[PDB]
Amino acid sequence: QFTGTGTGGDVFKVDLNEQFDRADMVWIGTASVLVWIMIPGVGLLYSGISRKKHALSLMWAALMAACVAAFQWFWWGYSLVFAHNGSVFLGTLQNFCLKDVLGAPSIVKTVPDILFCLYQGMFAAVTAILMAGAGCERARLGPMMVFLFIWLTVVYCPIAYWTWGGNGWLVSLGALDFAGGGPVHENSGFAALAYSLWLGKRHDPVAKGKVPKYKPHSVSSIVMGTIFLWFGWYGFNGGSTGNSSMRSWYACVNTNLAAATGGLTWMLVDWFRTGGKWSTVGLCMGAIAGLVGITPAAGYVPVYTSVIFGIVPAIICNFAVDLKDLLQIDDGMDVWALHGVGGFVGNFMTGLFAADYVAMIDGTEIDGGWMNHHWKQLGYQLAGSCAVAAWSFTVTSIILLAMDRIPFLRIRLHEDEEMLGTDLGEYAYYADDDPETNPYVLEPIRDTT
Amino acid sequence: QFTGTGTGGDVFKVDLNEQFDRADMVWIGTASVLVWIMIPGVGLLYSGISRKKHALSLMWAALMAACVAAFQWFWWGYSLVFAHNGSVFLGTLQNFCLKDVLGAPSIVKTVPDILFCLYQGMFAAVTAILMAGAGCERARLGPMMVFLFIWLTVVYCPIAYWTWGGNGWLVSLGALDFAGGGPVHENSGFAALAYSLWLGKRHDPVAKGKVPKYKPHSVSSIVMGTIFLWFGWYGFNGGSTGNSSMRSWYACVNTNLAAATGGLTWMLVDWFRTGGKWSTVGLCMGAIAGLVGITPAAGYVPVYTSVIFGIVPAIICNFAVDLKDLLQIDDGMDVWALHGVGGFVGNFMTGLFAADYVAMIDGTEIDGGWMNHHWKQLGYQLAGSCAVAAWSFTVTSIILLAMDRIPFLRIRLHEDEEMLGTDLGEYAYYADDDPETNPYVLEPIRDTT
Amino acid sequence: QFTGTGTGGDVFKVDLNEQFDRADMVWIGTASVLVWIMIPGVGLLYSGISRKKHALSLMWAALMAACVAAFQWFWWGYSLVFAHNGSVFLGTLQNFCLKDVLGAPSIVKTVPDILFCLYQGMFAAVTAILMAGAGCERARLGPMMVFLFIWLTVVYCPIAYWTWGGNGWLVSLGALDFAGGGPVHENSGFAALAYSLWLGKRHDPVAKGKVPKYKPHSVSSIVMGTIFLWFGWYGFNGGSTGNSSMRSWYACVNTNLAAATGGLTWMLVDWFRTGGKWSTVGLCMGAIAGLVGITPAAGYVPVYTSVIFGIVPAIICNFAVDLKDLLQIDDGMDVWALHGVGGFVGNFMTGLFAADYVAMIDGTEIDGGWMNHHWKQLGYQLAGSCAVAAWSFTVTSIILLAMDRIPFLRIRLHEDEEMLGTDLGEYAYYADDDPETNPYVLEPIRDTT
Ligand SMILES: CCCCCCCCCCO[C@@H]1O[C@H](CO)[C@@H](O[C@H]2O[C@H](CO)[C@@H](O)[C@H](O)[C@H]2O)[C@H](O)[C@H]1O
Ligand SMILES: CCCCCCCCCCO[C@@H]1O[C@H](CO)[C@@H](O[C@H]2O[C@H](CO)[C@@H](O)[C@H](O)[C@H]2O)[C@H](O)[C@H]1O
Ligand SMILES: CCCCCCCCCCO[C@@H]1O[C@H](CO)[C@@H](O[C@H]2O[C@H](CO)[C@@H](O)[C@H](O)[C@H]2O)[C@H](O)[C@H]1O
Ligand SMILES: CCCCCCCCCCO[C@@H]1O[C@H](CO)[C@@H](O[C@H]2O[C@H](CO)[C@@H](O)[C@H](O)[C@H]2O)[C@H](O)[C@H]1O
Ligand SMILES: CCCCCCCCCCO[C@@H]1O[C@H](CO)[C@@H](O[C@H]2O[C@H](CO)[C@@H](O)[C@H](O)[C@H]2O)[C@H](O)[C@H]1O
Ligand SMILES: CCCCCCCCCCO[C@@H]1O[C@H](CO)[C@@H](O[C@H]2O[C@H](CO)[C@@H](O)[C@H](O)[C@H]2O)[C@H](O)[C@H]1O
């Protein structure tokens, strides 16, 4: 009388909760709340790190992104990823507006559809604020909200379906992605790169010549953002087992250790490159790099290897940030360097260090990586990383270029039509300017001449 | 040997934990921690939104309210609501100072008394900081603490008993209030209105004529407060099932969606009313309106109806804020508009959209609302809303007026006796003024002439 | 086939999770996340309370301490406390780099080693930021990180083993320490005192003569730190049962009530001592005092006695702060007064109020304290308090003095060699100075003349 389809059965005839371990459900419910607070974590981080004055407050934009993402997910985002009648590349509209989303075992069988919807919806929201942060410079809010809705639909949801969907081709191939390093981090990173290369300011003074690599808008925002991110990451990674087993807590140990060693590695790198100074910004970026790096691996690799997921992503991401000076582009490039490069590196190394005896902690069966002489695992990881980066960069490019040719949907005004943050007899007046007291978004204005 | 009364049994003879599902207990324990952080959430929100400089820091006052509320609840607050020998209108002193509060099944049978005490005590504390926030302008701290203790005792505890107590008359009548929209939001809102009409400043310059509707003290405090509130609301609503069932996670999906759609609706409303600007304050107030609106409904209504609990409260509360300009009163009116009006609207609409098949997700039995052609449900909701508003407004009025006639308990000094924030030879001196560095409350001083 | 040693068994032959209640594991996993956010809680608290401008940002230093502590714990910290082949005074290197830490029942049998490692590692990190905060004035970061690593190894880990280890002598003697009042609070407090007496500035102008007792750097940081601490303390104390029983929720009620009554008591004390003012700093310090006080007792004492663990530590710690004016030393003394004195007082009073019927709520067997006419319990508590204070003060002294004689490991430069916060032709230049925008630690510089 448990149907396994639709709502899962008739609530007046069966107790749909009997299909699940109650403790499994509580941990995934708790983990969903933890991921939610990562959303303002992202907004605080990238507002504080910025080397220029964004007119849009990214702390506030995180709440905007939480609203847009939750509506998109309810509307059809959840269905396009986690419908049960998917087609290798995408889901369907079977769960449009969460129709019949209730007590059937989800793609992750240990939790019902409705709880998996709550949990996975937080991942989409985290990705939404990463994208708004990447593309925030001189953004117009109306076009940005439309962009987020579309981008979640045709960039996030296909990549997420490939990684997590019932018939997703990356699942079937054998690619490993424990907590969504592809859909969340690598995807947003390479979409950010599309923003940088197509819409970011060229020959940017903050990135041109010998300018300071770190010039933060607000160190206290960076620290608070990193606090929220690390705190929430326990749900992000620890919840990706779908259960209450000790593999969940194993993945939390790996998460903590990769962040710790990433933070120390990046700071040590900067200590050598500067000739002896201690980078406060660097420690935080290094913790994020390690957190990103361990994301595809946390439930698959032995604890002692988690330090490598801090060390190696921190080193590589540290040097990836230097490319901003070569391109002379700042906009969007921090998100690409931490999440795009970091996610690529972590996904790659999961193919090296994944171990079948770690997955088996809760009975999960995998062939393993190079730890289990499963050599082609590395090739499965590279196939996933290249497909994510290619789809994300290409489709995000198309979206941005299409909207740029529609004057009322142009996300970022062209320089020749831009007007200095003015406000609506014969003279005009300024509406300054202090985001701490201004109740309205300082929206870019188009020139009327 | 499980007695079901007093402590529940002898700990040396029985394992009182065997009466409960351990996972049910863990979720309610976690949900209690989540509600606790809503307390500073309220303080940050109303400090940041204020159109005038409150001498009392509401972020700090939230910690004060957490202290006063926890002591009151232990003293007799818990007993007056959740004693097992209640009388239709109030509990008793049987659990004075938490005497014999341990392992008997609480009014919510899935958790023991001691855990239900922890959980429900957080609701009283949230209500306490809502009240301190409503009445904070020019408040004297001593009188305010006394006021909170008394107000929790004779306003909150009776209303909470009616809504949740074992023999509460609203329970017996069939009124629905999932997570305490009456005791927390509608109650504090209409008590705030009593403060506005009796003690708030009249002909207030910030509310007189064509003044800006939004003029926030601190947008970053508003955003941080909204972060804490939304984050904590998952425990507030999700924990109100009393269990680990998937109806808990259903209610979290409803909570997230109502907040999202409320935030977007309020911002869209302001976009039309302003002629095209994006209100940063408005998005946050709209999320709160949706969170308040869904509170009586989250575990009773189908997911697709949760968007209505964002849209409709956001529209109505947006226009309710305009009444500050008609009365020319600012003090206390934001709390009334969001929690009083929002809670009334949400409680009303629960009678329309409550569905027996949603309650049945965990075996809870209800007749339903208009969704189940149970037409008189709407009348049960209006009976509860009118009783809460009438009791809260009337008794809060009486408390405020009584204390106003006692010079050492007067909460707010009269203008003729007030003295400009001075400090204790022949000349007097100022003690400025910066709440960031002043270690003492800037307490109003009575004129000695 | 459950071995109870090493990894606990073969994951390919047995399900190691079957040895544990899943709900017990979820609560301890959640409690671990809660303790983690106490780490920045400490950093915010002591940065905001400071009566002088620390060059090191303690909010940021909390992230540094989280990194150093997590690596030390993985390296050998966990093994030195919780290896299964311990020797009365210390553990071993059997679990070096978390080797074979998996599914054997930990010293707390209701959870496996890997989860107990995650949980107890957060306690070590909280202690690390308490120590960095105590010794932060004019600290050099390199030496400070080395100091933290060494101090965790030879001060924290022995004291923790005595209190919690399988063969720890304080366990065997019968000393009670529910949530680590000795290892975390009393230990860091008396190590802080060693910093004060050996390295703190003497005849300090902020502590000399009739200077203000409270002169906070940032009240908003104090409040935010206290928010994080109280919020996280639910995991700190509530998780120390190791299980999902209602004794966990009993301990949360005690925790909340001690904080509430501590906050009110300290503020009332200052109200009398000042002649009528309301101390905003005092309320927060009082909540911390009550939280510290209840830490050794929360799962052992009846609820109505928890108010005494707020009142008595708040009074005594309030007067302990006055000793800064007698010594004319400020550096490190707040940590000693709140955690050293508070932890001593709480540990003492646990011997008075511990009750066997409270421990028996989850089947834990103890003789009790004076509540059960077990008179020698008080002597067991004093033996633990004196051993912790003596070991912590003495070994911390030795570490600080040894490093002070090694010029590249000197934590705090001597005044004759110190140079005013300068930066690396013929003239030198300043690198000001604003921690909100400076991406580098303002590291003390040694004089080159
Ligand atoms: C910010 C703008 C917000 C716009 C969001 C749009 C909100 C409303 C979307 C309408 O969606 C459908 O409405 C139907 C009814 O109107 C539902 O059918 C329902 O019909 C029967 C009862 O009405 C039930 O038995 C069915 O299970 C149930 O699917 C259906 O589920 C739901 O998908
Ligand atoms: C299915 C996709 C449909 C669109 C296909 C068009 C592809 C053409 C190749 C790229 O063309 C360039 O794209 C830029 C980006 O649009 C334009 O820069 C313009 O737009 C940039 C982004 O706003 C600004 O930085 C520049 O100032 C401004 O010249 C630029 O003129 C245009 O030659
Ligand atoms: C900020 C100011 C703080 C003021 C708060 C007041 C704190 C003390 C209140 C006293 O409350 C009563 O004290 C009795 C003892 O003194 C307890 O009886 C107790 O008596 C026996 C043991 O003493 C037990 O078997 C009983 O169960 C137990 O109820 C009783 O429970 C408790 O309600
Ligand atoms: C059981 C209840 C016992 C009390 C019953 C008294 C009811 C009388 C009806 C209302 O009376 C008014 O109440 C106001 C509020 O008290 C007073 O305003 C006074 O108090 C206000 C609040 O502080 C200030 O705004 C005004 O300046 C100040 O005139 C006002 O004088 C008084 O005529
Ligand atoms: C910031 C600087 C970071 C420095 C931190 C140092 C990180 C690496 C430490 C090496 O630790 C050991 O490495 C061995 C292998 O290299 C492991 O043996 C392993 O050997 C077999 C597989 O290799 C397994 O069956 C064993 O269980 C397993 O203990 C062993 O566990 C582990 O303790
Ligand atoms: C196994 C332990 C090995 C070391 C044993 C040495 C024990 C000697 C007893 C204490 O000696 C004093 O220690 C202080 C602390 O070192 C020194 O103050 C020096 O160091 C202080 C801390 O930096 C500064 O405040 C002072 O300016 C500076 O004179 C001081 O000269 C020295 O007489």
Numbering used by the authors:
A (entry chain A), B (entry chain A), C (entry chain A): 4 to 427, 431 to 455
List passages from the publication reporting this PDB structure.
structures of the Mep2 transceptors from S. cerevisiae and C. albicans. function as ammonium receptors/sensors in fungal development. a central channel for the transport of ammonium. non-phosphorylated, with channels that are closed on the cytoplasmic side.
structure of the ‘single D' S453D mutant. The channels of phosphorylation-mimicking mutants of C.
